[PDB]
């Protein structure tokens, strides 16, 4: 095993070993960790950066915390670590809107300290293909190809190529029909130069990075699937995702250099 | 008149005035001029650069010269200047193949001096759209969109954007059907932000540059139209060209910054 990625109380501070933020190289967490020891009127408002961590040390949480918002807003984090009553919050790389927050209640002493986190919103385009035809959407894509414009029984590609020493982008698609395979948790291998098959594989195995954040959304019969990549990849990786609506089909090919 | 471009014996050495290479600013010719005064065995072989000039001073040419090749090759120049028996040759910016040459016969004294020019071939991609479906072609395009893949009665764009301080590129298309308008001598104006018409205009007026070289080719029912641009343009210019095959149509939009 050449396990080499970031570590946040994951299984192979330390206690088969957990790792706070066969060769198993441990990378020191690439982001800032914000620790709270348990502000104005028993509540604490905190702005988090994309990927920034927030750890709370509190042994009293009477119900599920940081799983709901303290206003008309749901700030969803993909990693809410619960261990030895030391909850861990990982700020996402994508969010539906700026008007979003999450709440946690820590019963410290005989007072309810409630934490509220907000995002330092940054307008982010998705490097990918929009195969839908609605001009109304909360998502912006680098490429577009309205699948309704393609002929029945035809197959057309929409290519996306990424070429940066270090990456920090969102890759995804918008499909008004069926997505093949279950993108982006599983992607379709690139085409061979020889007469060889192309299989469905997990994206994690193809890119070979840990905690690859995956995001999703839906706006009518339009499905949005996305994923975030932060850092340099070991090798130039390519993969595909198919969108298909009735007799029309279009496929997104993605090539990421390094 | 603010006539401001290159000059090669054109009408408004000097003799309403001709100009060897109302405000009329004369720009000194942006390329090297090669003069022959009239080599091995009464013939001269010369390699020319893209845009380089070659002037022959000879008062005796019994028939049309530099209009035909001295081998299985036709090296076509868009500007063959005939004035005061001082023929001028302007090397093109596009050529079908490397195996190409042109011949001229100068009756100097009592000996036939025959000039032969060849190109310093450089593999050049065309910034534009290939709407055809044949993999066999002598031309390479930056973008492709096989029009046979588009649905009947649908209209899809293929965009090309150029962004360089100084340009030296070929812009064009390959259409398997009808080209609208007569591209690239005349192009279709860009789309208005308001409810205003878009007209057919000459490309020369849109880009505002002199001697914009235009090239063409055909491979079966596939029509290739191209044009060359060398230098910085006064302002960010955009224009369109439509390709249409039966009920299918696709349009190339071109935006050139500066």
């Amino acid at each position, epitope marked *: 095993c050449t396990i080499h990625s970031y570590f946040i109380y994951d299984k192979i501070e330390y206690e088969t070993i957990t790792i706070s933020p066969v060769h198993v190289r441990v990378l020191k967490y690439p982001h800032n960790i914000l620790f709270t020891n348990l502000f104005v009127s028993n509540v604490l408002e905190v702005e988090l950066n994309d990927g920034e961590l927030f750890v709370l040390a509190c042994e009293l949480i009477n119900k599920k915390c940081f799983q709901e918002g303290k206003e008309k807003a749901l700030y969803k984090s993909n990693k809410i670590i619960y261990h030895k009553n030391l909850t861990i919050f990982k700020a996402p790389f994508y969010v539906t809107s700026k008007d979003v927050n999450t709440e946690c209640t820590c019963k410290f002493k005989n007072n309810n300290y409630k934490i509220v986190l907000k995002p330092k919103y940054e307008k982010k385009v998705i490097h990918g293909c929009n195969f839908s035809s609605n001009v109304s959407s909360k998502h912006t894509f680098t490429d577009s190809l309205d699948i309704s414009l393609v002929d029945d*029984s035809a197959h057309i590609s929409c290519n996306v190529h990424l070429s940066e020493p270090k990456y920090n982008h969102l890759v995804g698609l918008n499909c008004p029909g069926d997505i093949i395979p279950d993108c982006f948790f599983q992607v379709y291998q690139p085409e061979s*130069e020889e*007469l060889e*098959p*192309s*299989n*469905i594989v997990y994206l994690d195995s193809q890119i070979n990075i840990g905690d690859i954040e995956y995001y999703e959304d839906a706006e009518g019969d339009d499905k949005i699937k996305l994923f975030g990549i932060v850092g340099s990849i070991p090798k130039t990786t390519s993969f595909t995702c*198919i969108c*298909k609506k009735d007799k029309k089909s279009a496929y997104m090919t993605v090539t990421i250099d390094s | 008149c603010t006539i401001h471009s290159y000059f090669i014996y054109d009408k408004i050495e000097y003799e309403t005035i001709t100009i060897s290479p109302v405000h009329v600013r004369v720009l000194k010719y942006p390329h090297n001029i090669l003069f022959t005064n009239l080599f091995v065995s009464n013939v001269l072989e010369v390699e020319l650069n893209d845009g380089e000039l070659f002037v022959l001073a000879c008062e005796l040419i019994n028939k049309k010269c530099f209009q035909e090749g001295k081998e299985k090759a036709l090296y076509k120049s868009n500007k063959i200047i005939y004035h005061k028996n001082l023929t001028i040759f302007k090397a093109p910016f596009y050529v079908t193949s490397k195996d190409v040459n042109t011949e001229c016969t100068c009756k100097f004294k009592n000996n036939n001096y025959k000039i032969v020019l060849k190109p310093k071939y450089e593999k050049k991609v065309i910034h534009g759209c290939n709407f055809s479906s044949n*993999v066999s072609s002598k031309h390479t395009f930056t973008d492709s969109l096989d029009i046979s893949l588009v649905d009947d009665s649908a209209h899809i764009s293929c965009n090309v954007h150029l962004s360089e301080p100084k340009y030296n590129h070929l812009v064009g298309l390959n259409c398997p059907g009808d080209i609208i308008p007569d591209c690239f001598f005349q192009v279709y104006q860009p789309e208005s932000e308001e409810l205003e018409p878009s007209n057919i205009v000459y490309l020369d007026s849109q880009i505002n540059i002199g001697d914009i070289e235009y090239y063409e080719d055909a491979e079966g029912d596939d029509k290739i139209k191209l044009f060359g641009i060398v230098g910085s343009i006064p302002k960010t210019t955009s224009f369109t060209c439509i390709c249409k095959k039966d009920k299918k149509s696709a349009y190339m939009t071109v935006t050139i910054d500066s």
Partner: single-chain antibody
Amino acid sequence: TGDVKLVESGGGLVKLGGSLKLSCAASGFTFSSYYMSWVRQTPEKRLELVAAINNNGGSTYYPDTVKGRFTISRDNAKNTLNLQMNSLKSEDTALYYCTRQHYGNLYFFDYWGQGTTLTVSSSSGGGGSGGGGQIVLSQSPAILSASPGEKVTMTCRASSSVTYIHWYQQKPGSSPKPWIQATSSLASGVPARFSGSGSGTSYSLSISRVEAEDAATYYCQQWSSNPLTFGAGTKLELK
């Protein structure tokens, strides 16, 4: 011109050991953008890949049962597909379909021609001289006799892991037709009562309420490693 069309020509009767050339005329699509295959159907109704060629025609594949006897070729300028068949055996007696796949459709055989018959000529029937050094597909049951309005399920088991299965439906007198693409994505026009599911070595096709229209042979197909293989088929019956 028009919609996708594949016309197979040649075929008839050849003595054992003889030679024969088959041809396929493709029209209604950009032929050079598709992978082409010759897929035969034995008298036992087994489907077998005979040969495949890539888009440009530079890469070919032949299963060991035909390797060294058959030769696949394409002429992208003429829109034709050819198969030169040498040293013909009794095993080669089959209806030869010309069919297409695209890398972008997960190599799904979305169009098949009507087929050209070859009769090379003691008795036989079963198996198909295949099943060796390949992922084999085991379909169950062979005959599913169900009553209308019943929920039915047919299984497709694979000798070893396959990352997806394609389903095809065939009614007598016509070639196979796309039914379920990449395990669970129904083909165009396929009723909502149909569903497809699975992973690893176990896959299935289910019908929520069976009707007279569903009566057909359903084949599963895998392409996770060479050669590409199909199962034997589950004949759906409503007597």
